[PDB]
Design an enzyme around this catalytic site. Structure first.
Site, PDB file in Angstrom:
ATOM      1  CD1 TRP A   1      -2.792  16.695 -52.271  1.00  9.03           C
ATOM      2  CD2 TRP A   1      -3.599  14.633 -52.572  1.00  9.03           C
ATOM      3  NE1 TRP A   1      -1.723  15.846 -52.419  1.00  9.03           N
ATOM      4  CE2 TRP A   1      -2.196  14.573 -52.607  1.00  9.03           C
ATOM      5  CE3 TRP A   1      -4.329  13.452 -52.740  1.00  9.03           C
ATOM      6  CZ2 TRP A   1      -1.511  13.388 -52.809  1.00  9.03           C
ATOM      7  CZ3 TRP A   1      -3.644  12.274 -52.934  1.00  9.03           C
ATOM      8  CH2 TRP A   1      -2.248  12.248 -52.964  1.00  9.03           C
TER       9      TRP A   1
ATOM     10  CG  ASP B   1      -7.642  16.408 -47.167  1.00 11.10           C
ATOM     11  OD1 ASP B   1      -6.975  16.033 -46.180  1.00 11.10           O
ATOM     12  OD2 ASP B   1      -7.409  16.005 -48.327  1.00 11.10           O
TER      13      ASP B   1
ATOM     14  CE  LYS C   1      -0.385  14.151 -46.781  1.00 14.68           C
ATOM     15  NZ  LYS C   1      -0.067  13.327 -47.948  1.00 14.68           N
TER      16      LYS C   1
END
Ligand SMILES: Cc1ncc(COP(=O)(O)O)c(/C=N/[C@@H](COP(=O)(O)O)C(=O)O)c1O
Ligand SMILES: Cc1ncc(COP(=O)(O)O)c(CN)c1O
Lengths: 365, 365, 365, 365
Positions: free
Chosen positions: C102, C171, C195
């Site tokens: 990511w 992030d 999440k």
């Protein structure tokens, strides 16, 4: 199909174990286990009261007796009887009838709390009960102790001994509720539940209510009869699951005829095994005198009175492959011992009876 | 859907009770029950040794310590600790730290065996822990005694006190294995299993090996530390089932992260209830000072600092209706007591937390 | 029975879904669904404000930070972060810390708006965090970007890195509110809520209020931090239901102990699995260096470092038979991956650990 | 009893809200919620494919058209349409038709990405559509943009305008699937789902497959038609629950006669309210020309054209007593606005019709 001839802990009736398994997670709809149940709850108050009433009904315990459930096992009562009763008279003396390993071990434990006088000459081998007429009793002894059934040696009283008019203490751990008992003759009866009436962890003690309040100062509170009787065996957290198991076993005893039927079953199981030994033409030898042969524990030797070790191991190993457990005699005697407590059915004794006749048919001259 | 906040005996993990049930008739293919299992069999040897290893592994017990399992419960050790240790020095003196009802009862029992000295002025209320700098400790005392967690008054030690080198005895019945313990700094650790590591009938005792051989003569053999350590707890028939049950709970504790994880969960469980009390605007009142608040037992009152009997009955009646059991405070204190032992889950406390919030929202003025 | 180990979207607390179900037709008595509720109404202002306060409360967000809720997911921020901040310094350059899948995706996306420079040498495998000392930082860069938790490779920062006083963008999508965070050290924090804090559809973005006003000209107005912060995330119709769901999950986190309790629970959970891997004797292999192991996502292989496909399939097939979902590793990596976010309970991780242990016991050569 | 006249988010069919409620915890028996479902699972694949199939069926979308589901709402496409299409021709020009507030916002936002020419002179009042034959079209413009239905001013196209072969883009947010559409005549259609075909969080976009690959470098990946059409709306996590809700609403529109029946039901609904205004003899004022009046949104004033603030408050007050929500006009126009979207039934509108008729009869001078 295992056949458990355990000496203690012992076999429990299949019917009882099936109810313990079913109710293990939700006892009769309460939503919790007995292992989780509080000893202060109303649920457990009925459990312990039912167990006590089953002790008073089956044994016909007079109303002037206290029935209490303690911890520590029978060996715990080896210290509890002196601590509670050795101070009945100022001399702090106690008379003990030693007929086997347990009454002997008890007399040794009683020496910690006073002067202990054994009432008869020391027996060379624990093979008979010394005639109570020859008992040298002390009139100033606080009590007289004797073990009703010796688990290791197989010596059992078939009478209640005459002990002047003194207080009588009896260890019935291995023959508790095997036969009716005239409770009124005794001062204190105690028995570990793990033999003939339940699971290990709890000890039932029946005490005459005039013997409370004579305990020595060093007697632990959890073992003092006066304290434990005053709190209905709830002075501290009692063995809850063990009391619940004993009540189910007691219930099973009542359903199968009470103490009167247990004695009759104990005659059939013991006789069939004893008659195989008496007719064994010397191949099986039981050193105990016939008038004192225990109906609960039968220790015997194979081949000769000294014990043919080669023949015994073949007997144990071939009994093991036939799913017959705990036939190995005690460590301090060796040989073979067959325990025939209440749960041991007559079908289980027949398997042992047919196996002993066949093993003799294959090894005897 | 029952949520059991029992204070002793208390809730057992549901996964444990499921295994006890399916193995109750045939333990791991042996063919009998643990209830029927002899304590002299090879099978029970694995069970009792596995329980000891788990006690040593989870608490990091040093090798110079014995791990024995005795009968008699916690109050049995109130007598066993003096009987075995009070003769460590010639004075037969002992120091006790009374922080609640259980240490107080422990000091009263020890007076039966020697001269006891409570090291502090009598607390008007068991709401704190006297600082250990202000302790009138006897340098001639055989040991210093204190109760790590008071189950009735909710007062707990978050430190091991400095007894100036004396032998330290600690009662951890109600917080055993809820957090890591430095076993080396203690002389004797005991705990009743029925609170946090299994079911009633068995008591774990951790003794430093250099403290045996000082037991009094009146100390019963089944309670003498030296006798039971020299027999690996098999001096007489131990509570086989209670040891087997405790062994599973110890296995369950290690599977959930050991003692280090139990401390993390006890902090989350306890804080979520203390938060509701501290932010209750006086509706819920816990008298214990914050530095000594127990993370296992939280006692509190409702309405005012002295307790509104009407509100507390409505609280306990609606709590039972929601299948929340044994929230009623101890008979000698009253009010409410929430027990948050290991097996008590987070979803259990969350159900209680939501009920306390909904009840305060409905009855606060 | 279903145990949801989903990587994202993941499992939601059963109490949250139960409340969403009962209020779905008549939200708190107003007479309409939240799906029907206007984003300009008094009812929804109370919803989006409560969701923002919980974000500020649980993360202790300082008053000089804006909390805005956006659409487009985390990948949307991969463009919103450059569009809003790459013009902060005239050079239009940004430094990126690639620790997994990511970070690389975000660094590549950022190349569409300015010159992007990876600060560390290309790692042969996403298994360790390059030591912050090795970072080649540009003193003229507009910001420094790094991913807190790599959901595919299991590499997590347990520290806030030193970036030489530059603006720090993070992030935290797959570890948002799994632990406390020093927000004052960051310039921009964002996280997809699907999440660990809610359902898919909304992204939470925390921006320091002086970084507003540096957005490029090509930034869509719905993604401009200055526009949305001035409209309280109501520049256009926001994902109303997702924000309502996100608020309920935030309330559930708050009732369970906030960010502090989530860190304690995430430690117990990840330790339960890593302990199986570390003591598996090479049967389970987790390539991440233990000092950088994620506590949320645990990717591993079965058999060997490269992974035995035959064994891994039998694992996943049996795991699916046990109703354990989304255990298959990411497509780019394969193997196994366990996601243990906040809603994943301890009993859920206990079912998985018991399965891995039995599976290791059935196939270890 | 609540009548929801919401303008967006709007009313959903009671049938749809019920099935969403029944299946919230266990969707179709797969064990989990849609809120917990992974966008990569075979279960969500059926959901999004069915939602795509219904759009193609209910609108007769040709095969050379892609159907994608983005985030960012309608205002998201105000930036995504220029970013994707303003580069069809090198001039970076785009022709816009400003008939109300929503086309005006789209025209101003497009100026961030190029030079925007409004095709007609300023209207002075959003009360009509400028004649498409007087439209000043740029033959080198990249596309022509226009809003089919102006939600704030009630100005709707009842035709497809001739743009002389230019790529045509349309904002059908507030009348999507309220009537059949000849998709072949369009280049891009988009509509926020929260107005006519579901709940907020998702935007459907219909693009001709040869208009992909003209996106500027500055376009975010999550908003690039070419990227999102290549991954079937799964470039990142899509609004899973918002797409699922749309599928049920589309399935509801199909079960009620498709777009062809919605157009005729919308005619009945709007004709009922518009006739009450025309026959009101100046008590209800609608300034929009009849040939361009919207069938979805009917904004009007009470008393006189400029608006009687006293009467307009009692109208909204008594409407609120009767549970007729969201009838207040937009903030930039005030007055009244009744939104008659698909889920708004004839029985709902009749409650509004009877109320307007009774209010006029009670206050008309
Ligand atoms: C025709 C048309 N196009 C775009 C939008 C914007 O939707 P969003 O961008 O998803 O909010 C909308 C949203 N219209 C709503 C907007 O209300 P708002 O002014 O956003 O409170 C209305 O008319 O009241 C629209 O009607
Ligand atoms: C007759 C008898 N008496 C006493 C005991 C002592 O056992 P415990 O105290 O452990 O129950 C036993 C155990 N074999 C016994 O059989």
């Amino acid at each position: 199909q295992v056949v458990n001839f355990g000496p203690g802990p012992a076999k429990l009736p299949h019917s009882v174990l099936l109810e313990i398994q079913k109710e293990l997670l939700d006892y009769k709809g309460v939503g919790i286990s007995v292992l989780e149940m509080s000893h202060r709850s109303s649920d457990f108050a009925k459990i312990i009261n039912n167990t006590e009433n089953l002790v008073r009904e089956l044994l016909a315990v007079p109303d002037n007796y206290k029935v209490i459930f303690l911890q520590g096992g029978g060996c715990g009562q080896f210290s509890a009887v002196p601590l509670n009763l050795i101070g009945l008279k100022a001399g702090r003396c106690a008379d003990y009838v030693v007929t086997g390993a347990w009454s002997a071990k008890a007399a040794e434990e009683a020496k910690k709390f006073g002067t202990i006088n054994i009432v008869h000459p020391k027996l060379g081998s624990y093979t008979k009960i010394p005639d109570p007429s020859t008992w040298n009793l002390n009139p100033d002894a606080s009590y007289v102790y004797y073990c009703a059934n010796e688990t290791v040696h197989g010596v059992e009283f078939d009478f209640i001994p005459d002990v002047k008019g003194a207080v009588l203490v009896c260890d019935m751990s291995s023959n508790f509720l095997s036969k009716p008992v005239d409770v009124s003759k005794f001062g204190v009866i105690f028995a570990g539940a793990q033999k003939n009436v339940g699971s290990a962890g709890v000890t039932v003690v029946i005490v005459r209510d005039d013997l409370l309040g004579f305990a020595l100062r060093e007697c632990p509170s959890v073992l003092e009869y006066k304290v434990q009787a005053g709190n209905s065996s709830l002075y501290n957290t009692p063995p809850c699951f063990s009391i619940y198991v004993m009540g189910l076993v007691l219930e099973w005893i009542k359903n199968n005829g009470g103490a009167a039927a247990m004695e009759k079953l104990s005659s059939i199981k013991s006789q069939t095994i004893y008659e195989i030994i008496d007719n064994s033409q010397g191949f099986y030898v039981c050193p105990v005198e016939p008038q004192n042969r225990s109906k609960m524990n039968i220790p015997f030797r194979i081949g000769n009175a000294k014990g043919d070790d080669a023949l015994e191991k073949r007997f144990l190993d071939k009994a093991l492959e036939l799913n017959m457990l705990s036939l190995k005699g005690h460590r301090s005697v060796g040989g073979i011992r067959a325990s025939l407590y209440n749960a041991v059915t007559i079908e289980d004794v027949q398997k042992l009876a047919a196996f002993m006749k066949k093993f003799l048919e294959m090894h005897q001259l």
